[PDB]
Amino acid sequence: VSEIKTLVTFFGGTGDLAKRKLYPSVFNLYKKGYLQKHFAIVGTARQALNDDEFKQLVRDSIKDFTDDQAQAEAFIEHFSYRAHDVTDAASYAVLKEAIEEAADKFDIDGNRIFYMSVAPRFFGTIAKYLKSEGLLADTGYNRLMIEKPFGTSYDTAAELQNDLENAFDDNQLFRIDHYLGKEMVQNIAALRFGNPIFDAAWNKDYIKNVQVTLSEVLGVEERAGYYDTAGALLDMIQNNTMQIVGWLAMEKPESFTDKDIRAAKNAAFNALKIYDEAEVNKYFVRAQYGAGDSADFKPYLEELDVPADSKNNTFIAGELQFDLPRWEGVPFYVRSGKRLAAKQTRVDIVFKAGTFNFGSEQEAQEAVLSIIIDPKGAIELKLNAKSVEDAFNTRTIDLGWTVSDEDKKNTPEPYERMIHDTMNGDGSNFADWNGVSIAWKFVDAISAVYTADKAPLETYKSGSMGPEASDKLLAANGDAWVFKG
Amino acid sequence: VSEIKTLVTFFGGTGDLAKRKLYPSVFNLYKKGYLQKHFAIVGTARQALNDDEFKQLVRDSIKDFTDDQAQAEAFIEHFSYRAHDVTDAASYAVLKEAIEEAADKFDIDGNRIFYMSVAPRFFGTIAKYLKSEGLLADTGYNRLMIEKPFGTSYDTAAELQNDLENAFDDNQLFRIDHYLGKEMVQNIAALRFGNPIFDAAWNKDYIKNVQVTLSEVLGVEERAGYYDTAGALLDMIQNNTMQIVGWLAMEKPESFTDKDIRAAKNAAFNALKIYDEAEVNKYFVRAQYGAGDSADFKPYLEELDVPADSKNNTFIAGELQFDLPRWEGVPFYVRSGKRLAAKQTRVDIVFKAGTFNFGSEQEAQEAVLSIIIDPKGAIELKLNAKSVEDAFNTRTIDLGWTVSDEDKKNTPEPYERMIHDTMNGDGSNFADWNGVSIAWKFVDAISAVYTADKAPLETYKSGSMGPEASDKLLAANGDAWVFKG
């Protein structure tokens, strides 16, 4: 395995995410041998810790992932720490020093990765200071890993992008996308492009509609402070659903390189129809979860910290239209919500039914290619076969496949994947600015209608797949949801 | 369920097949309610039995399939018997009488089905006498069910057909085909025509080659008397494999009616290339099973009743070429043999590998659509997906489906199916003369080369999938057998 020479700095190095996910992930890259000698990890935050105390912090962090004591300690030796205030410009000179000493001690020439595991409000400020205070490398690469969320509207995101471009280019920006870094999501291009029979049918001539579902069983729990301002539209649709749709709607790329993949995705994003008030009312649905069955499933307005006068959407369902010749007339239905029937992230490609008449009671029905992303990876294909009857008749059978236990064990952690791809300079599993800006332009149109109360707010029984308005949406084009719960 | 009014006569009514398969099958049609009041079954053979004794013969026969005693007896009451010599013309007048009395007793107007469960040498003689001695109905239908085999060469079969056409038309002839009456074989048209994604790819643009395997684990057992004269070529290839190929190679029919289906099959059969001596040597392989491992698996020449100077083929493998635009350049590999690795009847459609380059170690491989007919019905689809590795790479996964226990229980017996279709006048699951004559013309070309010893005879270890010459055959076009045992 080839060695990766890099210097990673962790802003918010003492944070919960750093201990719980970040450090164990880079430890895995060490266990696999990607990180060997020529690497260093500088941690930073406000706390007044010295190197030994930080090393101890990393030690406790990777303790539940350690088999070999000597291997753990050899890794820990690559860490250092420097107390620093991100809002204090002068303070960056102290971090600059810790970085250069790390590069000298381990002989790293440039190749810097900056991780901002801090509050979103510091994101652009750090970026601008990395440039002005000269913490950027003059050799190799300079890559920035930005945590969620990337703005709360197109304006804020545009302002953020503007600040980041002061030190980096868009292709140096790696925005943490939890759903893009999923194994099954990465299987879509393989099934499509790797198999001529699907690749040739991935268009309007064979597909009736594409469905994307991100249902959850849980409610708002304690996250009401955040959720009441964001809702299903911002919390799930904007970032997680839009990017999955990006992999489904993309054109066929020139090659499988990140540049070509992004170009192919933007081809679809640039053809995405942005809606006005009338269309938002015609094509989208916003809902709030009402009473369930037992007293444990209380409505949204009775949840902890919910203002009672909240018109927050805990469910969203809508139709996306792309003005690309290959998707002309093919609706892309999306939906996501809290307190639904089952926890599941899936894509269902509904193929047009065949027009060959068998002369049977049951004629050929619509074939479906399902790709279950969460909780366990699975691929299913409901096809038309012959029924076991006396007279010739059709029926639909399901050919399926599920990930094996060996598959699950060999699957890299979401954060391991993301850190690794950044070190590689592979942006194929990351969204670019075009994809993110269009996603915001689309969602902003919808949000404008909602805050203005220019669209109805539906309700649904907790435990169902949403309100009937969601089914009304598909029935309008003669379609229906494949996953009924 | 609608009632079928018919009069079935059984030549060889006292035979083993009649007791063991025939009677229990028609009893099922009674249990399901297809046969109600207006039907009669006249049994005939040389034995001097009266009606009561024959009724007793049918009683013992259906005893292991009886739940309701009253239902069994009500069925048995529809039977009668008449001793008769098929080689005695005058004797047919006595059978004629038993038939007319049966039609009167149960009020059946015409609709006669004649079953010849006798030695093949009487087949044409009975047919000619049915006409001359006036046992044919003047109202309704007159259908003849012929048992295997339909000739031993094109000549004998052509002579047989000529005799049968003296009383019936080809569409009134129902030739017992054990493999055509199988559930999975009948699923091929459904998967293809019922699913646009397969229907559109069922041609030279997407298919690399089609493979048909009819492997058996057993040897010649006791059947050496018959097998030494027939071999794998006549015993399995001519009748069973050719017809399965007929369902695979057929064009897309105008409708799913027997006439259109036969026309679509003949479109392929008429384009089947008949081979000369050179081609038989280039495209086919004949083999005889040699020693296995343990002393129980002795070679063919050491089997009971085998003449030791036998050049009989217990294995055959060959390539079939169709001069149809849709199959231009697509080889149809077939193989069947005794003493092979596993008992299995399957079709494997090998799709051309995709030309999209991922830039991975493993590029897109060939997708396969497998249809396992025996022992248990199953459909598999090996597709290209993403491997569980750190770097993007492809792998092939298998999406599968197997028949359920409810499926197996609801599946009609092969003979029930055939009798039922004849009563319906449905020839779609039966071969016509064109299909049978071409099959013979093809096989005769090969047999001419073998008896003349103008082609080598290979050998193979009992337990393998055949001789290396079989693999040499596919390697010549860059293909290989999917089923390795």
Contact in structure between B95 and B82 (CB atoms under 8 Å)? yes
Q: DSSP secondary-structure letter at B239?
A: I
- The two beta strands, B284-289 and B315-320, are antiparallel
Q: Residue B303, class by beta-carbon neighbours within 10 Å (0-12 exposed, 13-18 middle, 19+ buried)?
A: buried
**How many CA within 13 A on the CB side of residue A455?**
25
Q: Residue B483, class by beta-carbon neighbours within 10 Å (0-12 exposed, 13-18 middle, 19+ buried)?
A: middle
A379 → chain B, closest CA residue: B399
Helix (H, G, I), strand (E, B) or coil at B107: coil
* Residues present in chain B in total: 485
A141 in contact with B at a CB cutoff of 8 Å? Answer: no
Give the gap in angstroms from C-alpha A357 to the nearest C-alpha of chain B: 7
Contact in structure between A117 and A10 (CB atoms under 8 Å)? yes
Q: DSSP secondary-structure letter at A170?
A: G
Report helix angle B433-451 to B154-164, nearest 10. 150
Contacts of A358 in chain B (CB under 8 A): 190, 193-194, 256
Contacts of residue A52, Cβ cutoff 8 Å, sequence gap at least 6: none
Q: DSSP secondary-structure letter at B314?
A: S
Query: Which of A200, A195, A189 minimizes the C-alpha distance to B364?
Result: A195
A136-175: b or e for each residue (b if 16 or more CB lie within 10 Å)? Answer: bbeeebbbbbbbebbbbbbeebbebbeebeebbeeebbbb
Contacts of residue A279, Cβ cutoff 8 Å, sequence gap at least 6: A273
Query: Which of A177, A188, A257, A242 minimizes the C-alpha distance to A428?
Result: A257
B421 in contact with A at a CB cutoff of 8 Å? Answer: no
A362 in contact with B at a CB cutoff of 8 Å? Answer: no
B201 in contact with A at a CB cutoff of 8 Å? Answer: yes
**Which B residues, 227 through 256, put their C-beta within 8 Å of a C-beta on chain A?**
252, 255-256
Contact in structure between A325 and A473 (CB atoms under 8 Å)? no
The string of DSSP codes covering A39-57 is EEEEEEESS---HHHHHHH
The angle subtended at Cα A441 by Cα A436 and Cα A446, nearest 5°, is: 125
Residue of A180, A255, A356 to mutate for B, most B C-beta atoms under 10 A: A356
Helix (H, G, I), strand (E, B) or coil at A87: coil
To which residue do tokens 């949840």 refer? A303
The angle subtended at Cα B430 by Cα B450 and Cα B259, nearest 5°, is: 120
Give the gap in angstroms from C-alpha B100 to the nearest C-alpha of chain A: 30
CATH numbers and ranges of domains, chain A: 1-175 (3.40.50.720), 176-484 (3.30.360.10)
- The gap from C-alpha B340 to its chain's centroid, in whole angstroms, comes to 20
Query: Which of B109, B138, B126 minimizes the C-alpha distance to B44?
Result: B126
- Indicate yes or no: CB of B399 within 8 angstroms of CB of A385: no
Amino acid found at A356: F
Cis peptide before B149 (omega within 30 of 0): yes
- Indicate yes or no: CB of B392 within 8 angstroms of CB of A186: yes
Contact in structure between A483 and A348 (CB atoms under 8 Å)? yes
Query: Which of B264, B349, B379 minimizes the C-alpha distance to A384?
Result: B379
Backbone phi, psi, residue A280, to 5°: -60, -40
- Cα dihedral across residues B445, B449, B455, B460: positive or negative: positive
Contacts of B359 in chain A (CB under 8 A): 255-257
B234-257: b or e for each residue (b if 16 or more CB lie within 10 Å)? Answer: bbbbbbbbbbbbbbbbbbebeebe
Amino acid found at B250: M
Cα distance between residue B327 and residue B325, in whole Å: 6
Backbone phi, psi, residue A8, to 5°: -110, 130
Helix (H, G, I), strand (E, B) or coil at A204: coil
Cα distance between residue B357 and residue B49, in whole Å: 76
A412 in contact with B at a CB cutoff of 8 Å? Answer: yes
Cα distance between residue B413 and residue A151, in whole Å: 67
The string of DSSP codes covering A239-303 is IIIHHHHHHHH----SSSSHHHHHHHHHHHHTTBPPP-HHHHHHHEEEEEE---SSTTS--GGGS
Joined tokens for residue A57: 């912090």
Provide the β-strand partners of residue A287.
Answer: A315, A458
**Which A residues, 8 through 27, put their C-beta within 8 Å of a C-beta on chain B?**
none
Cα distance between residue B222 and residue B217, in whole Å: 15
B424 → chain A, closest CA residue: A391
Joined tokens for residue A429: 């599993």
Cα distance between residue B93 and residue A478, in whole Å: 65
Query: Which of B322, B211, B276 minimizes the C-alpha distance to B444?
Result: B276
Q: DSSP secondary-structure letter at A309?
A: S
User: What's the start-to-end Cα distance of chain A, in Å?
Assistant: 44
| Residue in A189, A194, A206 nearest the CB of B196 | A206
- The gap from C-alpha B104 to its chain's centroid, in whole angstroms, comes to 36
- The gap from C-alpha A283 to its chain's centroid, in whole angstroms, comes to 24
Contact in structure between B294 and B305 (CB atoms under 8 Å)? no
Amino acid found at A86: V
Contact in structure between A79 and A58 (CB atoms under 8 Å)? yes
A196 in contact with B at a CB cutoff of 8 Å? Answer: yes
Cα distance between residue B331 and residue B480, in whole Å: 12
B411 in contact with A at a CB cutoff of 8 Å? Answer: yes
- Indicate yes or no: CB of B200 within 8 angstroms of CB of A200: yes
The angle subtended at Cα A273 by Cα A272 and Cα A278, nearest 5°, is: 155
Contact in structure between A176 and A147 (CB atoms under 8 Å)? yes
Query: Rg of chain B's alpha carbons, rounded to an integer?
Result: 25
Backbone breaks in chain A after residues (C–N over 2.5 Å): none
- Locate the DSSP E strands across B168-231: 173-175, 207-215
Contacts of residue B314, Cβ cutoff 8 Å, sequence gap at least 6: B219, B220, B227, B231, B232, B287, B288, B289, B300, B337, B338, B339
- Indicate yes or no: CB of B401 within 8 angstroms of CB of A399: yes
Joined tokens for residue B360: 């991975």
Give the gap in angstroms from C-alpha A325 to the nearest C-alpha of chain B: 20
Contacts of B384 in chain A (CB under 8 A): 190-191, 194-195
- In chain B, the largest separation of any two C-alpha atoms, in whole Å, equals 85
- Indicate yes or no: CB of B194 within 8 angstroms of CB of A390: no
Cα distance between residue A432 and residue B477, in whole Å: 46
Contacts of residue B13, Cβ cutoff 8 Å, sequence gap at least 6: B43, B44, B45, B54, B81, B117
Cα distance between residue B146 and residue A27, in whole Å: 75
Give the gap in angstroms from C-alpha B201 to the nearest C-alpha of chain A: 7
Helices and strands, counts by H and E, chain B: 17, 15
- Indicate yes or no: CB of A356 within 8 angstroms of CB of B186: no
Contact in structure between A385 and B191 (CB atoms under 8 Å)? yes
Cα distance between residue B368 and residue B396, in whole Å: 10
User: What's the start-to-end Cα distance of chain B, in Å?
Assistant: 44
A32 in contact with B at a CB cutoff of 8 Å? Answer: yes
Experimental method: X-ray
Give the gap in angstroms from C-alpha A145 to the nearest C-alpha of chain B: 20
**How many CA within 13 A on the CB side of residue B450?**
26
A405 → chain B, closest CA residue: B388
Give the gap in angstroms from C-alpha B453 to the nearest C-alpha of chain A: 45
A418 → chain B, closest CA residue: B390
- Edge-to-edge strands of the sheet including B112-116? B79-83, B39-45, B6-11, B112-116, B142-146, B173-175
- The two beta strands, A6-11 and A39-45, are parallel
Contacts of B201 in chain A (CB under 8 A): 196-197, 200
Helix (H, G, I), strand (E, B) or coil at B15: coil
| Residue in A186, A257, A356 nearest the CB of B386 | A186
- Indicate yes or no: CB of B379 within 8 angstroms of CB of A399: yes
- Locate the DSSP E strands across B181-231: 207-215
Cα distance between residue A139 and residue A118, in whole Å: 27
Contact in structure between B127 and B167 (CB atoms under 8 Å)? yes
Give the gap in angstroms from C-alpha A318 to the nearest C-alpha of chain B: 27
Report helix angle B433-451 to B242-249, nearest 10. 130
**Which A residues, 364 through 403, put their C-beta within 8 Å of a C-beta on chain B?**
364, 367, 379-381, 383-386, 388-390, 392, 394, 397-401, 403
Contacts of A399 in chain B (CB under 8 A): 379-381, 399-401
Contacts of residue B160, Cβ cutoff 8 Å, sequence gap at least 6: B123, B124, B150, B151
Query: Rg of chain A's alpha carbons, rounded to an integer?
Result: 25
Q: DSSP secondary-structure letter at A237?
A: I
Cα distance between residue B443 and residue B299, in whole Å: 26
| Residue in A199, A384, A388 nearest the CB of B194 | A384
- Indicate yes or no: CB of B400 within 8 angstroms of CB of A400: yes
Contact in structure between B368 and B185 (CB atoms under 8 Å)? no
B423-427 contacts: CB < 8 A, separation 24 or more?
B423/B4, B423/B6, B423/B29, B423/B34, B423/B113, B424/B4, B425/B141, B425/B143, B426/B258, B427/B171, B427/B174, B427/B258, B427/B262
B356 in contact with A at a CB cutoff of 8 Å? Answer: yes
Give the gap in angstroms from C-alpha B96 to the nearest C-alpha of chain A: 32
